Design a protein around this ligand. Structure first.
Ligand code: CL
Ligand code: ZN
Length: 133
């Protein structure tokens, strides 16, 4: 399937899941698709209130306030060789690409890999300070 694909990028998949995300975060993620050594898609951009309420009931978030609800966050999924991976190092590499794109665009993007506790690789967001909501 992917033997003749000299540079593997999940552009179309990512663009679809970026619909409704804040245009400034979209711009950063689209640029990061160009830079990342690790192919990735966006697994979740906009999240519904009902899904957030479900997370709060189940305990995977403390609050109904989420940057995903308003368009200010994405979760990425690493797709090395077209196969989903949850391994940390892939997300570290993705974050290099995101950080470079972000910098080029003049926008700070926070990465869940730099959360003070319970670090997790998929999450990127625009800051509350820069992009209040
Ligand atoms: Cl930086
Ligand atoms: Zn997230």
């Amino acid at each position: 399937s992917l033997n003749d694909i000299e540079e593997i990028r999940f552009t179309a998949r990512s663009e679809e899941n970026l619909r409704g995300v804040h245009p400034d975060l979209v711009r950063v993620i689209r640029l990061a698709l160009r830079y990342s050594l690790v192919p990735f898609s966006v697994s979740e951009g906009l999240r519904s209130m009902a899904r957030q309420r479900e997370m709060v009931r189940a305990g995977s978030s403390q609050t109904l306030r989420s940057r995903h609800l308003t368009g200010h966050a994405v979760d990425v999924v690493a797709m090395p060789a077209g196969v989903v991976s949850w391994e940390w190092d892939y997300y570290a590499q993705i974050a290099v690409a995101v950080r470079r794109a972000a910098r080029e665009c003049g926008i700070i993007v926070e990465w869940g890999g730099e959360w003070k506790t319970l670090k997790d690789g998929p999450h990127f967001q625009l800051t509350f300070r820069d992009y209040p909501a």
